[PDB]
Design a protein around this ligand. Structure first.
Ligand SMILES: [K+]
Ligand SMILES: [Mg+2]
Ligand SMILES: [Mg+2]
Ligand SMILES: [Mg+2]
Ligand SMILES: [Mg+2]
Ligand SMILES: [Mg+2]
Ligand SMILES: [Mg+2]
Ligand SMILES: [Mg+2]
Lengths: 51, 337, 132
RNA sequence: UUGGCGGUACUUUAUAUCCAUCUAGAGGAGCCUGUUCUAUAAUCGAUAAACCCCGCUCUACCUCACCAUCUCUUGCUAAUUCAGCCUAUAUACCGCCAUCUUCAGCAAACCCUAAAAAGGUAUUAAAGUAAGCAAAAGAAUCAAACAUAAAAACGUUAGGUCAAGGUGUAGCCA
């Protein structure tokens, strides 16, 4: 998936620029995993970092 | 005998057996054996000054020589490696993207159209395939002749798009004919704020019904796979569409461009009626937003507002708002379009 | 149908040279002879020997200049002298041609016991008479 | 919407041709020669038109590829666990051809169509266009013509030829 294929990409709450890519700019809703194609493990990890 | 030896072209011509009675009316692969051969190099390993080795080395005029058995075996093995590597190179290829499926041509980019008569490059345009038919007719050439009909669409993603059909006996030719024909039939599609249509569009082209809806930002393209391809070429980012009746690809392409190119912009509506066009977004509250004002004289007669409109409503649109359960297939989670 | 020495029609994408385009019945009408000796004139001898020497000289030049020959070679015999005139592509470096000329001349003079000279005209690429 | 063949037997058409007209033949006898058959220990291929004085502008030996019998085993070459192989498949092919045939078609690239499965002509002209291949022209038969030669694309017959030669695949190496 997009996160796993690139090891240097890190899902951390401080890495806001990465987290913003997974949030809708217009509605501010976090995209569901099928939308971006991330695996469920990383999607759950991303949701926690965004929150 | 040395006099019964033939050239490579005639040896491969016979072995391949491409021209033959079986081939035409119903696998061997050609190879080039002079690819890696360097003029002046033989099995014996002789070194020929001026042919396969430097004529002068460190200021010394070289003389004939021969490589040792160990040195020659290395050179033979090295060439064997290079030949094996070349075979690997032939197997390797750069994967291009599939379309709506893995074995289908629909949705596959084939690049920009060819340059024009006076060096008019079209690098900003992208071409997409929509249908590829392999149809056979009955002509004396093969008894049953072969034909390839290709429907393509082109667009710059900035409002200009067009479609054309190209027919030929070879698929590659049908691509060129369609691709360069479509650049001569560019519609311009009006986009509201550059991301969606100006208003709902409902139309019937022959037996194919299309029903498009204007949507807010972030909605994405929730449309027939062929409409998503065209919408990306046009530049529409957020829209909903439903297609019913016949799924003919040509009627859908003709019907889509017919409806998208006949829509009324807000600036046009203000001029036709003479009134201001105001916008009310729920995320901006009651704030009235003026999006278009009449170019000439603003009228003072309010537009008649009927108590009960006589609009013709679609049961499909209304059914949802009436509380009727939708299908299991509606509004499923899908990848970003 | 006659299949002899005819480069058959393709679909307009095959580049044939002037020599290749013309069928045998145009010999002595539109295109000349690649070899010129006196052995086929009336009351002359050694036709068999001149014809065999030509066959070899054509196979030798192909192998000695592999992939560097733009067209068939032209053989000219005057007295005991043999002259080989070949159009050669500019693929190889210049000095390599000087080696192959010195080698092929010396080798063919000691094989047929006649003075042999090589005349090479270099072309940028094969000349196309027509696309057939 | 096309393609086909059906009984296209209908109207014009062939031009040494379908019948008619004309001349000399074949069909009978004797031989010469090819083929089939019979047959031999004893080639092969061609074998309706488009095989049958055919590959052969050529078999007493040689030629020879066949049969019987005896003999050789690194056995043409600079080298090679290699040389050699007329061993099977022309239904894997190259090559060179027969055939319709001196038949007239084969037509790439563009352009147009209220969509095109296709079509694209009107001359007092209405969407077709500008280039090739064949034909024509040109050249040959030593003035000129005519005639004769040569030329004749794409397909048709998996037509003929692995035995002109080369070659794919499989088979034989005391
Ligand atoms: K053949
Ligand atoms: Mg697949
Ligand atoms: Mg046979
Ligand atoms: Mg004999
Ligand atoms: Mg004998
Ligand atoms: Mg034998
Ligand atoms: Mg004349
Ligand atoms: Mg002519």
């Amino acid at each position: 998936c997009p996160i796993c294929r690139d090891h240097k990409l890190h899902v951390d709450f401080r890495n806001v620029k990465l987290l913003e890519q997974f949030v809708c700019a217009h509605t501010g809703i976090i995209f569901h995993a099928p939308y971006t194609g991330v695996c469920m493990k990383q999607h759950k990890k991303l949701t926690q970092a965004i929150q | 005998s040395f006099f019964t030896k033939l050239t490579a072209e005639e040896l491969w011509k016979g072995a391949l057996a491409e021209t033959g009675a079986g081939a035409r009316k119903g696998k061997k692969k050609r190879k080039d054996l002079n690819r890696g051969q360097i003029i002046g190099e033989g099995r014996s390993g002789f070194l020929w000054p001026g042919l396969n080795v430097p004529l002068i080395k460190s200021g010394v005029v070289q003389n004939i020589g021969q490589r040792s058995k160990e040195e020659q075996q290395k050179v033979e093995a090295t060439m064997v490696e290079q030949r094996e590597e070349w075979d690997r190179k032939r197997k390797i290829k750069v994967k291009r993207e599939r379309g709506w499926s893995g074995n289908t041509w629909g949705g596959v980019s084939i690049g920009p159209p060819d340059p024009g008569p006076n060096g008019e490059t079209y690098e900003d345009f992208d071409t997409r395939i929509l249908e590829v038919r392999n149809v056979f007719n009955m002509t004396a050439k093969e008894g049953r002749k072969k034909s390839v009909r290709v429907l393509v669409a082109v667009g710059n993603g900035n409002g200009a798009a067009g479609f054309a059909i190209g027919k030929a006996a070879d698929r590659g030719d049908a691509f060129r004919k369609a691709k360069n024909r479509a650049i001569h039939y560019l519609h311009y599609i009006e986009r509201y704020e550059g991301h969606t249509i100006f208003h709902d569009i409902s139309l019937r082209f022959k037996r194919t019904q299309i029903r498009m809806k204007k949507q807010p930002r972030g909605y994405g393209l929730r449309c027939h796979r062929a409409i998503i391809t065209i919408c990306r070429l046009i530049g529409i980012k957020d829209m909903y569409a439903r297609v019913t009746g016949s799924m003919n690809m040509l009627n859908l392409t003709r019907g889509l461009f017919h409806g998208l190119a006949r829509q009324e912009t807000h600036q046009h509506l203000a001029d036709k009626k003479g009134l201001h066009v105001v916008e009310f977004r729920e995320e901006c509250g009651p704030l009235p937003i003026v999006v278009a004002s009449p170019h000439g004289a603003l009228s003072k007669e309010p537009e008649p507002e009927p108590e009960v409109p006589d609009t013709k409503l679609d049961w499909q649109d209304v059914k949802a708002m009436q509380g009727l359960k939708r299908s299991v297939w509606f509004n499923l989670k899908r990848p970003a379009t | 149908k006659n299949r002899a020495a005819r480069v058959r029609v393709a679909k307009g994408n095959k580049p044939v040279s002037y020599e290749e385009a013309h069928a045998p019945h145009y010999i002595a009408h539109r295109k000349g002879w690649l070899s010129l000796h006196t052995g086929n004139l009336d009351g002359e001898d050694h036709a068999a020997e001149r014809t065999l020497e030509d066959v070899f000289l054509r196979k030798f030049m192909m192998g000695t200049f592999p992939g560097c020959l733009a067209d068939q070679i032209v053989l000219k015999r005057r007295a005991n002298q043999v002259d080989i005139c070949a159009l050669v592509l500019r693929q190889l470096p210049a000095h390599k041609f000087y080696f192959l000329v010195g080698y092929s001349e010396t080798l063919l003079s000691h094989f047929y016991k006649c003075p042999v000279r090589l005349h090479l005209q270099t072309v940028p690429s094969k000349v196309v008479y027509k696309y057939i």
